[PDB]
Amino acid sequence: PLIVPYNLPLPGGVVPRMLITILGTVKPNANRIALDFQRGNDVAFHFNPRFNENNRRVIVCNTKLDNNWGREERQSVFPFESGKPFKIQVLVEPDHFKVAVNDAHLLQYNHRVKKLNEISKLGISGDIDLTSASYTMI
C-alpha cells in the first residue's frame, strides 16, 4: 500500500489527453477524500468527496489561489462507498478536468488555473487505502 497523503509529481504539469488513475479502497467509516492538483502553493483543482456533511454525502470541488478558496462546485451524485474499492480517473481536456469513478462519468471542472504546464503535483489524501497512482497519455 502507498503512503497517504501521497505526492505524485506531474512532470511539466498537465496537458490535454493526460489521464491520471487512482486506485484504492475507501476505509470503513470514512469521512473525507481529497485530490489536490497543485500549481505551487495554489490548488488548481481540489476534488473532495465528503462522506458526512450535515449527514449527506457530496463531492466539493474548488480552487485555492493565494491561500483563498473560491466558489465551490458541488456534485450530489456520490459514487464512493465506505469499505469498497474504487477507481478515480481524471482526464485532462482542453477546457476542464473530466472525472470518472468506477468507469462512470461523474463531473467536469472548468480550468480556473490556466497555466496547465505549471500544475505539477497531485496530492492524494484522506480516508483511503491507496493502491496505485499513475498517469498516461491517451
Ligand X SMILES: Cc1ccc(S[C@@H]2O[C@H](CO)[C@H](O)[C@H](n3cc(-c4c(F)c(F)c(N)c(F)c4F)nn3)[C@H]2O)cc1
Where on the chain is the footprint of ligand X (CB under 6 A)? 32-34, 46, 48, 60, 62, 69, 72, 125-126
Tell whether residue 72 is among the known ligand binding residues: yes
Nearest residue (CB) to ligand X, 3 versus 138? 3
Least Å distance, CB 60 to ligand X, is: 5
Tell whether residue 69 is among the known ligand binding residues: yes
Nearest residue (CB) to ligand X, 32 versus 112? 32
Which candidate, 47, 1, 43, 55, places its Cα nearest to that of 23?
Answer: 1
Nearest residue (CB) to ligand X, 48 versus 138? 48
Tell me phi and psi for residue 21, to 5 degrees.
Answer: -120, 125
Tell whether residue 50 is among the known ligand binding residues: no
3-state secondary structure at position 118: helix
Which candidate, 33, 62, 69, 45, places its Cα nearest to that of 118?
Answer: 45
Tell whether residue 75 is among the known ligand binding residues: yes
Tell me phi and psi for residue 118, to 5 degrees.
Answer: -105, 0
Least Å distance, CB 76 to ligand X, is: 15
Q: Grid coordinates standing for 118?
A: 505549471
CB atoms within 10 A of CB 80: 19
Binding site for a beta-D-galactoside, by residue number, is 69-75
Binding site, by residue number, is 69-75
